[PDB]
Design a protein around this ligand. Structure first.
Ligand SMILES: COc1cc(Cl)ccc1CC(=O)N1CCC[C@H](C(N)=O)C1
Ligand SMILES: [Zn+2]
Length: 139
């Protein structure tokens, strides 16, 4: 679990969104595993606007932050689950690192702010759903 709170928005993994998130839906994209819902209170998380390929992510399964090098946002094949059939997930970035299913939602950050959230993993790899292209999160 885990979410990004910026302005009047909440960004979460689409597969972990709540009834409240869906009743306050702003935008969702199955192909990216993202859902954005509206909030009454303000969020102060700074979203990075950069092409950083290094950063730090939070791993709840280890109660630790890990530094990682990560790939450019791209279309990567992701195997089936109780949430999705097997498909290409877009805007996905991989790093060599530890993750487990309950790690989805952990934030990846660079020196410029929030880059994205944990969305996939397996085989010593961890995948992050990029959010740096969602320019409207600030305005
Ligand atoms: C961090 O997630 C891990 C990690 C490991 Cl090692 C093993 C399994 C998972 C879970 C995972 O990748 N899923 C299930 C939830 C939806 C995801 C998606 N974006 O399509 C795919
Ligand atoms: Zn950056």
């Amino acid at each position: 679990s885990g979410a990004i709170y910026v302005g009047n928005y909440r960004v979460v993994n689409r597969h972990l969104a709540t009834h409240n998130d869906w009743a306050n839906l702003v935008w969702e994209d199955s192909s990216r595993d993202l859902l954005v819902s509206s909030t009454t209170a303000q969020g102060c998380d700074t979203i990075a606007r950069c092409d950083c390929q290094t950063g730090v992510y939070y791993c709840s399964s280890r109660r630790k932050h890990y530094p990682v090098s990560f790939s450019k946002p791209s279309l990567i094949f992701v195997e089936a689950s109780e949430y999705y059939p097997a498909r290409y997930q877009s805007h996905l970035m991989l790093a060599v690192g530890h993750s487990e299913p309950g790690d989805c939602g952990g934030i990846l950050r660079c020196q410029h702010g929030v880059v994205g959230i944990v969305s996939t993993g397996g085989n010593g790899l961890v995948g992050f759903a990029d959010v740096r292209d969602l320019l409207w999160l600030d305005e």
